[PDB]
Amino acid sequence: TTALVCDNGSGLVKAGFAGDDAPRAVFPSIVGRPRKDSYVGDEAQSKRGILTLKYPIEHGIITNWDDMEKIWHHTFYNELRVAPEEHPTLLTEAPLNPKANREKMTQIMFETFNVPAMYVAIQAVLSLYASGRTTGIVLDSGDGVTHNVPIYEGYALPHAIMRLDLAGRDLTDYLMKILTERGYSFVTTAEREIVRDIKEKLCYVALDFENEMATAASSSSLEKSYELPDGQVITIGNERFRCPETLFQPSFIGMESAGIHETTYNSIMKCDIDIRKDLYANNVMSGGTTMYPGIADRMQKEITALAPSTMKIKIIAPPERKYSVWIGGSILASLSTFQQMWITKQEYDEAGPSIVHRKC
Amino acid sequence: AFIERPEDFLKDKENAIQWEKKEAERVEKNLDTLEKEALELYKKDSEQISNYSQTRQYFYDYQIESNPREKEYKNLRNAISKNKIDKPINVYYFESPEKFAFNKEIRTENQNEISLEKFNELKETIQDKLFKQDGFKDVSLYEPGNGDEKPTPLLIHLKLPKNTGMLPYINSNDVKTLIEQDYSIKIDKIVRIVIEGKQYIKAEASIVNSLDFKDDVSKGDLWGKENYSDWSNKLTPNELADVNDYMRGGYTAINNYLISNGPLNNPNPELDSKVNNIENALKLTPIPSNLIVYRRSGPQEFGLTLTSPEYDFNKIENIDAFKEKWEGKVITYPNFISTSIGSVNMSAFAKRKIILRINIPKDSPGAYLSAIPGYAGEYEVLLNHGSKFKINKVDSYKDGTVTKLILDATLIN
Numbered sequence A: 001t002t003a004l005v006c007d008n009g010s011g012l013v014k015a016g017f018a019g020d021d022a023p024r025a026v027f028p029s030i031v032g033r034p035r036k037d038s039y040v041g042d043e044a045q046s047k048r049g050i051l052t053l054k055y056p057i058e059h060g061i062i063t064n065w066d067d068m069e070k071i072w073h074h075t076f077y078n079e080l081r082v083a084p085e086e087h088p089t090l091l092t093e094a095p096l097n098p099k100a101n102r103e104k105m106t107q108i109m110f111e112t113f114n115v116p117a118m119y120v121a122i123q124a125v126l127s128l129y130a131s132g133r134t135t136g137i138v139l140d141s142g143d144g145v146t147h148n149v150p151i152y153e154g155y156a157l158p159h160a161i162m163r164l165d166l167a168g169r170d171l172t173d174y175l176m177k178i179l180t181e182r183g184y185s186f187v188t189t190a191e192r193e194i195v196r197d198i199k200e201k202l203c204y205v206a207l208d209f210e211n212e213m214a215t216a217a218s219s220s221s222l223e224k225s226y227e228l229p230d231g232q233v234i235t236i237g238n239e240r241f242r243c244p245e246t247l248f249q250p251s252f253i254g255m256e257s258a259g260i261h262e263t264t265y266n267s268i269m270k271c272d273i274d275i276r277k278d279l280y281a282n283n284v285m286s287g288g289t290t291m292y293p294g295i296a297d298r299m300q301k302e303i304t305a306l307a308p309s310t311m312k313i314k315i316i317a318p319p320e321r322k323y324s325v326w327i328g329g330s331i332l333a334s335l336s337t338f339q340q341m342w343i344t345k346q347e348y349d350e351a352g353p354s355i356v357h358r359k360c
Numbered sequence B: 001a002f003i004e005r006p007e008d009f010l011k012d013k014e015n016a017i018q019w020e021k022k023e024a025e026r027v028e029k030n031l032d033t034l035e036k037e038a039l040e041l042y043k044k045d046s047e048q049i050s051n052y053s054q055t056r057q058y059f060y061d062y063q064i065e066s067n068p069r070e071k072e073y074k075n076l077r078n079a080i081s082k083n084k085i086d087k088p089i090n091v092y093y094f095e096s097p098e099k100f101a102f103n104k105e106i107r108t109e110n111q112n113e114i115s116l117e118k119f120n121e122l123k124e125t126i127q128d129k130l131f132k133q134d135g136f137k138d139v140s141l142y143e144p145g146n147g148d149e150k151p152t153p154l155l156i157h158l159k160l161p162k163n164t165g166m167l168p169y170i171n172s173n174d175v176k177t178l179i180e181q182d183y184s185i186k187i188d189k190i191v192r193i194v195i196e197g198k199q200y201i202k203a204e205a206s207i208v209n210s211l212d213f214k215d216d217v218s219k220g221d222l223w224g225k226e227n228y229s230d231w232s233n234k235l236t237p238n239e240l241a242d243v244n245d246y247m248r249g250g251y252t253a254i255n256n257y258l259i260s261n262g263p264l265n266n267p268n269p270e271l272d273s274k275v276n277n278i279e280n281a282l283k284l285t286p287i288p289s290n291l292i293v294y295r296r297s298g299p300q301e302f303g304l305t306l307t308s309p310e311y312d313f314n315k316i317e318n319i320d321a322f323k324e325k326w327e328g329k330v331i332t333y334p335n336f337i338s339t340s341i342g343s344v345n346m347s348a349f350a351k352r353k354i355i356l357r358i359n360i361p362k363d364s365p366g367a368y369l370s371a372i373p374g375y376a377g378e379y380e381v382l383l384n385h386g387s388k389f390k391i392n393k394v395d396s397y398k399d400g401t402v403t404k405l406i407l408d409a410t411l412i413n
């Protein structure tokens, strides 16, 4: 019958049916065992006490297949509520996913879940596709990792892919850190989900970080109020933007890597010069962690100031962004001309797991 | 007048000059336009030019090309190798003993006299050390005597290999020799000598060849693949599974377990059994030749934080402090130690301030990890955990406004 799109991130799982315009199933990528023996999704947060939480996906690479399994399993039956056998299945994957994972994704999908067909698309690519393009550079930033992924004509360009271990997860920890340095105290694993919420509600990237600091230090206008689950209220000030700033200045968090604007120019520059023009004018942003008001305009400034003054710079950041890798998945999987592109079980069962190697 | 020069002209200025002019005349006739022009710019401006060629390779590739000074470097490089030597030769130049990591002071300007005391110190600070040598320099072809400039008390007698590039060139009235240093230098023997009734130290040095790709990460990659491609596979059914563990995106677990001692404090056979192989992965095909590699390192590895004030090398006291603490000393790494075959900067560590330049002896524990595909694209060489490195020398260069350190080190093991 109807195809399937399951986007596997390190924090969230985004899952649904091809052709819809938003994932029906969006739930945390955690598996819980205890010291009877297996729990997934929410009814594993619920549980947290009797059990120990593991994140099967780390920095967007799959690190424990046994838990993924549970993950994928829950997904089909407890979440989407269909059967691996009646539906073909599109899956996403991080850039620079090693040949073995891709390979192992196949068997498991075929020889376990037993799906007539499947496909695997790089994440940033789908995300670029959902925005009608097939050449450009994607800043994809999720819960455990961010990537600058330069793409030309549908193909990601591995030599120039830029990777950075710093995402919303880290940006929450730091929010927890400097909020604490302030009066408040955040300690539990279930108190974090609170700051995580503040971050999503209240942070924002400053167009020019210093003027923000000084406006903050010399007046009250920037101060938002938050309302804790029951009763009490916290107040937040320059934290509101010191947090996402990390992205541009990882040093905030003790990292000495380049920031988001610099790794973009860096990635663009490892690319054939003929194509740089198109990268600059097709900078697509995607991922939970790109959702900060102000983020597009800062990238557009920080980038403007690194590139040749004659250069034309365009920073594309749609509101549908947070779930775009999924959307491009659904578009792709629903496309008449794509149907003769799956890897079918007859495709697998016969020729090996080495088939998935689909550089078009 | 020699038909073929000797391998060492020793004290015989007159023949050396007589042969080098003849040679300078020849060789100059083989330079092309860009080459001569290059030479013509060296004479007018050699200090700034040499400086550039010392610390040229540490910037981003695009900062390297976009340098107004790099045009000249490349041209002078070419010129130098245009004429590779005959057969070996011995050259003479003065050093500052600073260069050898002897920060004290042999004996000052007006003394014509050298302390037995200071002398023994020196012998001790440079015995069994390799010291990496980089950048253009002028050298002379005979030992100085009465008449020649003698600017330091330190005189280096160096045996250049059969194939070295060497440029003898006229400048107003004397003959000069230009070379591009590219090797490390062992001092075999230092002796006290006298010249014009004055006392000077004389160091006998020889070149230990190691391969050094510097900024030519391509050259480097070919090499790397040429050795490590059949390794990608050869690595056997249980090390194959284990290998893909540090090279599974996240290393701040596998290192962080080794740093704050996991092994005999916190035993956890879930990673020990990983290690006893991830270690033999590197031990599968050990390094096929003396290889220089570059590690960009962060403040922890040298007992500091990002925020420590003694990490601001824009202030020399902190350098001087850094040197006292580290120069001469040998540091041990509990972690698998993660280096690249090329000196270029990069986004992953754009802002790190300590470059570790490591000579690795032939036959040591490691591997060109960047020989797997997919994984591919940063020219990585992995060095086996529990490695110890000898820091022979600390240098420094400005990178933008930020001052960084280049640590010349040898892996002992």
Ligand SMILES: NC(=O)c1csc([C@@H]2O[C@H](COP(=O)(O)CP(=O)(O)OC[C@H]3O[C@@H](n4cnc5c(N)ncnc54)[C@H](O)[C@@H]3O)[C@@H](O)[C@H]2O)n1
Pocket: B251, B252, B255, B259, B294, B295, B296, B297, B298, B299, B300, B301, B302, B333, B334, B335, B338, B339, B340, B348, B349, B378, B380
């Ligand atoms: N650093 C390089 O020159 C280099 C070349 S390739 C490369 C790659 O980039 C990624 C980043 O690697 P990395 O530099 O984080 C490896 P590493 O994990 O060694 O460094 C991580 C952090 O911990 C600190 N640290 C590291 N080793 C020690 C130690 N022995 N004692 C105390 N503190 C320590 C460092 O200063 C740094 O802040 C890796 O995937 C690696 O493969 N890095």
Ligand SMILES: Nc1ncnc2c1ncn2[C@@H]1O[C@H](COP(=O)(O)OP(=O)(O)OP(=O)(O)O)[C@@H](O)[C@H]1O
Pocket: A008, A009, A010, A011, A012, A013, A059, A060, A141, A142, A143, A144, A145, A146, A167, A168, A169, A196, A199, A200, A201, A286, A287, A288, A289, A290, A291, A292, A322
């Ligand atoms: N408005 C918002 N502002 C900032 N961050 C947000 C916002 N909404 C969600 N996030 C963050 O986005 C992250 C999840 O986004 P996403 O699902 O793209 O990552 P992932 O795919 O789960 O993991 P990764 O992409 O790193 O593999 C979480 O850290 C979450 O807090």
Ligand SMILES: C/C1=C/C(=O)O[C@@H]2C[C@@H](CC[C@H](C)/C=C/C=C/CC1)O[C@@](O)([C@@H]1CSC(=O)N1)C2
Pocket: A011, A012, A026, A027, A028, A030, A041, A042, A044, A045, A143, A168, A169, A170, A172, A173, A193, A196
């Ligand atoms: C449906 C939903 C998703 C969500 O909010 O995002 C996710 C949820 C979370 C899993 C933790 C527990 C089980 C789930 C709590 C969910 C509450 C309802 C909201 O993994 C994050 O916490 C990561 C880790 S730390 C951080 O900063 N991000 C972001």
Ligand SMILES: [Ca+2]
Pocket: A008, A009, A010, A060, A123, A142, A143
């Ligand atoms: Ca993701």
